[PDB]
Amino acid sequence: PRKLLPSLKTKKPRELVLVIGTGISAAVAPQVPALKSWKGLIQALLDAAIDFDLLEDEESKKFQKCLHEDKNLVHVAHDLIQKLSPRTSNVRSTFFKDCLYEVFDDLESKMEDSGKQLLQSVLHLMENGALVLTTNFDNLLELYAADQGKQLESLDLTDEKKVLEWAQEKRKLSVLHIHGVYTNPSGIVLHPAGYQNVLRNTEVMREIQKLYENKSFLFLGCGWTVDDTTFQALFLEAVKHKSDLEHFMLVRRGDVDEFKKLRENMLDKGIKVISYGDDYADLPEYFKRLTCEISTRG
Amino acid sequence: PRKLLPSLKTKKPRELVLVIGTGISAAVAPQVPALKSWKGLIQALLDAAIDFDLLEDEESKKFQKCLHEDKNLVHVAHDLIQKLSPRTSNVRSTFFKDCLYEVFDDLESKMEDSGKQLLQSVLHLMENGALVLTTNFDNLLELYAADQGKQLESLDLTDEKKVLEWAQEKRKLSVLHIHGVYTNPSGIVLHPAGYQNVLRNTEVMREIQKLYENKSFLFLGCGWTVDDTTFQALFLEAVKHKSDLEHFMLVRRGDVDEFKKLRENMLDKGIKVISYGDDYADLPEYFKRLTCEISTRG
């Protein structure tokens, strides 16, 4: 198989900042449309909007029409967010709560060991002291973290005190959601202009330079992530040094052409490349070894 | 066994300049491919390149193809160096660092007393004040030198100031690597034209005559180093006196024919022959005696 990663073995778990994307959510049993892919997310919220009649026939037809010939997924998800927000004050919004909390539940009932190893290694990293952020609305990881008895809370960008106090890292055992959480419907912001107004403080992205300048990330199930504008604006807007980065990322192998294409474009971004077997079943053993040597040397 | 060397006994250890080659690295437990033989080094790098996918299948196939029907081993190692160097600026080159630092580690875990006596007597020679240079990429000797508490630095030909102040022998307790070191990936140069441009100063090779003209070397695990072109380029190009040399070299005995052919050819070069017992086990006692008598008379 693929042996121990050269750099990863010697990095301290403190500097390790794990990032989880659609790959880990797809490691969970793929029967919920929300977790197979990002495309199946918007399809899931569609099916939830049609069956719960939040949205009349013609405009569900429009949003479906976006699906076949598609472009600009994040804008379309934002157009959705905007059209489902005519609410007055709170009114326990049935246009929001009763769609996201329909789509993103029924998740635990389809949990197996093959995805379970991922988050148990994650709990090993957190008990080492590693910081973790995610890119999905789901909340399965911290639910099963609470399953064995480790309380893990969901954070967002709306709560200013928690974001301000989270950048300095004193609050360990905490996972920030760069997109949102279904357990807190008022805490999701996705449009590019929505996370800029709450981040009006230029001193608080001075407090985020400690993530990208010095701390080491590890993008799991990513790569299309570095393509959309959210990570460019939260990571690469306020830093001009691509010559000396310490960030890492893990994806599948496959056809050699896109292999070298991703190689070159995220060397231009400045992350290291790791592709191992595209077998969908050697990532568990490889990543759980990674975590255990990290914990032992840590 | 083989008693004390007639000439060596009376040499003061300052005149002694120890050279270590593939024999000492093979004295270490021979299960890393890198240290059993020079041949074994390039296959270790080839195996590292295949499993980490620096080169595609066909390039690795060509590289494998040179192995079976071989020639120009240093030339092929340079071809490997050139094709693994498309990097931009530094970019913590994954084509170099993540290959050499994979191959040349996992070395200390296989360290035993039979190889330990060699380096511990080496430490004796250093505390006498002898000079030592190496011909292999490894840094096991300096690592275990630092094990008991003696700090030993790895030097190369790239840093011009260190090489300039090193030829005078003002800097003691220092070891240059005629080939390179794995702890400094940017400090390795092997192709014949690489160590001439950095050595553009003919006055600095005039500062090198004090090695070959007056200082006494002692080549351990050598004999094939006087066959390739690096030793001839750095030693015999600027020296025209083979009538009066003062240099030594130690190797195995064996077939009498090959014994006398090496005898004659390196008498033509101008070194003394010592072949003892090819038992792979009386070199420790013989060389450790040699070193203790030199230290006592030093």
Author numbering:
A (entry chain C), B (entry chain B): 28 to 325
Task: Please share excerpts from the published article on this structure.
We recombinantly produced and purified full-length FAM118B (referred to simply as FAM118B) and its slightly truncated variant lacking poorly conserved and likely flexible terminal regions (designated FAM118B24–334), both with a noncleavable His6 tag. As cryoEM showed that both FAM118B and FAM118B24–334 have similarly strong filamentation tendencies—suggesting that the N-terminal and C-terminal tails are dispensable for this property—we used the FAM118B24–334 construct to investigate filament formation in solution using biophysical techniques. To perform cryoEM reconstruction, we treated filament fragments composed of several protomers as a single particle. This approach produced electron density maps of FAM118B filament fragments composed of five and two protomers, at 5.0-Å and 4.1-Å resolution, respectively (both obtained using a focused refinement in the last step), and of FAM118B24–334 filament fragments composed of six protomers at 7.8-Å resolution (without focused refinement) and two protomers at 4.8-Å resolution (with focused refinement). The part of each FAM118B protomer that is well resolved in the density maps is limited precisely to residues 28–325 for both FAM118B and FAM118B24–334, indicating that the flexibility of N and C extremities extends slightly beyond the parts truncated in the shorter construct. The final structures of all individual protomers of both FAM118B and FAM118B24–334 are similar to each other and align well with the AF3 model. Individual FAM118B protomers are arranged into filaments in our cryoEM maps. Both FAM118B and FAM118B24–334 structures show essentially the same assembly where each successive protomer is translated forward and rotated by approximately 40° around the longitudinal axis, creating a helical arrangement.
Here we identify family with sequence similarity 118 member B (FAM118B) and FAM118A—two understudied vertebrate proteins—as vertebrate-specific sirtuins with similarities to bacterial antiphage sirtuins. We show that human FAM118B forms head-to-tail filaments both in vitro and in living human cells, a feature that appears to be conserved in both FAM118B and its paralog FAM118A across vertebrates. While human FAM118B and FAM118A have individually very weak NAD-processing activity in vitro, their interaction leads to markedly increased activity, suggesting a tightly regulated system. As expected, the FAM118B sirtuin domain comprises the large Rossmann-fold subdomain and a small α-helical subdomain but lacks a zinc-binding module.
